[PDB]
RNA sequence: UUUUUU
RNA sequence: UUUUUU
RNA sequence: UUUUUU
RNA sequence: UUUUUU
RNA sequence: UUUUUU
RNA sequence: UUUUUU
């Protein structure tokens, strides 16, 4: 009767937020891994330049352990800040890892431990020398930068160090946009971002890393989750306005503008196209369940919080519920109308197992052959029937 | 049902202002660069004239470091004020740089440090002499001014110094309008502004810098963000009325009238043409999402504050969300009707990847062949059907 | 009549807080002096030990400039903190001086500048070498510590460094109690404090500086006001409870317990003895004005704020109004009863020009020969007349 | 007039809580020392017995570093708990030190590191062997226990291990009562406590450590503040009732009953004797200031919190204000009446510099020759005048 | 600063 | 201005 | 700490 | 930017 | 990202 | 799970 079909809606709403309530216990505590991070102790430009060169070499090194690579990545990311240790310690929310901040102090060819020399330090020094030697020998004499003069470059001016560091941060931060979604199909959007930032003169093109180093760093970023979590935390903190933003922070926020809502193109495309742009072909007895699921998904997305856009980057378990597969019909309709309407829509790889070609064809027809689609008109267009006819005439 | 398609609007509104709340921490502090600024200590016209000649030479100098160029630019901009040091210190909001104000004191061919002569001063003196020599030799004997007599000119009268300084400030401030949007396509609007100010007799044409110096200064301004931030802060402070405005301040505000809303022509054109000038072809099921996005953008623009018009100049990350690409359909419609209606509209370079030629054609037709477009008439024009027919007859 | 003698009280109350209202302008800005502070960049014990040895040598050095001595003192005081630069920058309220924090980085015999070596650094290195040589030659081969082995001691363990640093901070902080009140008559209370802290095992007596170095440091502390202001700010910050206190902080607070209310023994003795311990000889027509002045002084002291106890250390101008001389009669009475009652009271040098021997004799008599002094008894001692007689019998 | 002498009370009350308000900053952060703690990983009795034997040897060792001694003490104290690591981590509030909990795992003659054997482990093994050898050689073949058979004793039963561990904890916890007050004058009250616990059969006398080991451990406890802080935290946590108490916890609480209010005998004796036991000789114009100070001290003690009784153990700076010296007159009176009344009172060493023999004699007379001291009688003893006379007749 | 008993 | 004890 | 009666 | 009348 | 006029 | 544009 009347009561049923509403009890169903309440049941689905309750099932969506079924057990996602309360607070968990500390028993489910992940084992922690020690990660050694080399941060610059002082503000001298030469020390910071040598440190970032060392971090580039370590990241490029093939014999480097994963923990050393994560340490080098953390050193690189926090290089712009005047207090990298404070930035790392105050913007770390990774239960998987524990970070031991190490102030570099002075600067040799590698790093001088300067803590009980001879006792448990010489082995670390030889290890760092081996890492550097393997990094330099692995490449065919090619420096990490696309320009050989950028590697063996002496930096003593603060402005030059700042420019080079900003360029390195920009080139690193380009990769996060398509690091886990489709790392193989990258180097096109990344090149577009690099060209955009070069044309804006925000980055000096002299310090441009080669594509081999970029591929290695992207592979490291995709393999590791702690680096992604740290960078997402940095993005969230920068997104919060209120204070003055520096050049590095502004570049990071501009990149995060592209980073947001990555890996969830299906859901947002479904929203924008199938749900909005109201077409008379919506209520047809095969889209009502999908509409209810979509509404529940919007409520869940609002409930998640500030980490919702970067759900794929943090690899949230909630992301699976957002993926198409629970609403294949409306999703297929929406991507059909998207591919017919948006030219850019159509390069997306959507050869899934629930394509529903009938509904894709229905959406394709609904986009063009359906009708002009005159929605409720606040202004009284009494004589616009001929206008609608002319618009549909194309 | 009824509830859906409104939950969507609330979801998009919440997603727009998703994480832009709260206050950030001091951990994300950009590394600061020392910038040396030479300000005139006294009000003697000869000292100020020599100082601005030195600043012109330093800016024109090719061997000058970037920090020295920024110092010379800051010296030039604050030259009009009777207390340049106070103006710089009370109108600086650049976290990227720290300014060390240096009172010039006396005036030699370069600048006399007059602080422990011999100790850490002789090297600076030789450096300044090298800068001046390189600046003079780099040009083919051409002075920065278009008139050779304007360079080696003795100034002892306050009025002549004021006139020359005002001319230099005007010619510098013309460049900010098209410094980052399209610096290459400049020298047309800049020449138009210069002709306008010459015809108004606000600037004395004798102190007219050559186009080579203007190109060098524009390149420096585009490369550097601190100078842009300082000049935008000056524009914002001058825009606030209430006090008496001097000739320099009035010229600066008149230039800022053109400076405002630069680099965002797409968004404002979309507003003015597609949104306003209500055409019966608006509600057609492919513009509703764009309308919602545009409304959210207006709310965001109102929320930003007084820095909203100069978003491109400060290179805000929020500017990316305002750029066309998130609403290509309504944007294309609006630029179509603009190019058909506004003659000046059409010189804009809009060969983007989301042009949507079908909607551009639809807007072109909507501008002329659609209808006369009679909106709600407060006055009862019962007999104006023939008037509308005659108006449409063209 | 009745109205008069109350208008007088209101007049004196208004005269006390006559012009101490409103906010001052920035025109009265003291000229600032640059002070170079060498802080340890890292946490390595050897670097910190070498740095504090260098600071001890600089303080002991006779050829050192005053600014260098203040820098060495600031380096010494903030040595215990893990972030000396942050502690100095967040606890500095000295308009007289500006502090340029310098991270030491590495550690040579002196300090390596490690910033454009050769350019404006070699002269500083030779200056530091001259400072060290003069410091070592000035003494008759005597190390700053009372033990010659404590100077040329290698420190690699964190615990030993912490113990030595705590001892040095304690021995430095003993001097502030009697640095400006009576520096010449010191070395008795200072020795008592040192013995107290040795018996408590809070300080290791091996790192005990000689008395010559202590005298030099006390002279430097008395000469300089910025060091006193910084140490008073540290005392005020430590006094505020709420957080966990370390060994250094606990020692500093324990010393500040003695530091408080220094240099104002006359006023507080007058309060405690003349005002409290109510004697029938108070209201005698020569103490009413002094009572009114004392009440006004209490109101002023409450109004001053948290800096009231350390008024002599900061050399407040308000301290002059608190000194005896505006109420010599009641002050003389109070010191008379104090010298008769308190055995320790009597070592105070009070041979002032307003001693009023008649009132001193009156107080001496009031202490003993006056009466037993039975105040209002809450418990009804109906039979205690004989008890009072026996008590007065002595 | 009437207003004065109350403004004085308000002034003293405000001066007592002068600057003890607000929250301190993190700039005043003490440097932290790494402390290595060896905790038993499993519950096997043999492993725990070997671990506590090793800790006893390390504490007795003269060549052991202070950090190793603190680690051994922490291992000993938390030995009773089934999860020593959790107990240490959840009951540590020492900003001076950082604790790195180390699970022992297996058990060799010393401790097997069992973490990358050969790499940075062999040196630690040789160090532990040297520590054990020096500990065994330093003594004249004397085991830490008073019985030679208790050292080389095999423990495989859980009950025997529990009994031995409880005995060791008891003998360690006896020392805290007089570790910092008068460690030299100990071994009398400690022997009395040991005899009390032996007569109660709570501790098995077979595991009785020799007096040399007890003296060494007491010296270590007096030297170190972190161990005292940890043990005081344990005492505070145990004092909070509500849960079931084990034998070790009950013994610890019984010992803490004696531990409480240590090192503050002067203040509490002054309270109990001078303030309570109301004598007609109180209000005599030389005790009113002391009464006000005592009231302020009671308010401060109530305001301090649960850490108030163990103020001397934590070496609070607030303890100095509680010590006699700010109220020598009432203190002398109270100790006089105490020495006349309480037989145990009189062994206290009170040969201070502010004894005031006149007031001590006055208190001695007030105790006996003053009067019977009949206070307000709720029951109407109309005929008890002869009873009071007989009571005074003695 | 502290030196009792409990 | 200041010269004790704590 | 405790040493009665009940 | 401005180019009338008043 | 941006390329008009004002 | 993901593969557009921005």
Author numbering:
A (entry chain A), B (entry chain A), C (entry chain A), D (entry chain A): 1 to 394
The authors write:
The HeV Ncore structure follows the common bi-lobed paramyxoviral N protein fold and includes the Nt-arm (Met1-Thr32), NTD (Thr33-Glu260), CTD (Glu261-His370), and Ct-arm (His371-Ala394), as well as bound E. coli host-derived RNA. The cryoEM map of the HeV N protein assembly fully resolved the N protein core (Ncore), however no density was observed in the map corresponding to the intrinsically disordered C-terminal N protein tail (Ntail, Ala395-Val532). The N protein surface is overall hydrophilic, with three prominent hydrophobic patches that are covered by neighbouring N protomers in the assembly. The Nt-arm alpha helix (α1) contains a strongly negatively charged, solvent-exposed region facing the central cavity consisting of residues Asp3, Asp6, and Glu7. The HeV N assembly map showed clear density for single-stranded RNA in the RNA-binding cleft that separates the NTD and CTD, which was modelled as a poly-uridine; one hexa-uridine per N protomer. The RNA molecule is positioned in the conventional ‘three-base in, three-base out’ orientation, similar to other paramyxoviruses. In the case of HeV N, the 3’-most three-base stack is oriented in towards the RNA-binding cleft while the 5’-most three-base stack are oriented towards the solvent. The charged RNA-binding cleft consists of a cleft floor and two ridges that follow the orientation of the RNA chain. The cleft floor consists of the NTD-CTD-connecting loop Glu260-Ala265 continuing into α12 until Arg272 as well as the α14-containing stretch Ser317-Gly326. Within the RNA-binding cleft, a series of conserved basic (Lys178, Arg192, Arg193, Arg352) and polar (Thr181, Thr185, Gln199, Gln200, Tyr258, Gln319, Ser344, Tyr354) residues likely interact with the RNA chain through putative hydrogen bonds, salt bridges, and hydrophobic interactions.
The first gene encodes the nucleoprotein (N protein) which associates with the viral genomic and antigenomic RNAs to form the helical nucleocapsid. The paramyxoviral nucleocapsid assembly entirely covers the viral genome, protecting it from detection and degradation by host factors and serving as the template for viral mRNA transcription and genome replication. Here, we determined the cryoEM structure of the recombinantly expressed, full-length, and tag-free HeV N protein in complex with E. coli host-derived RNA. Following cryoEM data collection, a multimeric HeV N protein double-ring assembly was resolved to 3.5 Å resolution, enabling the building and refinement of an atomic HeV N protein model.
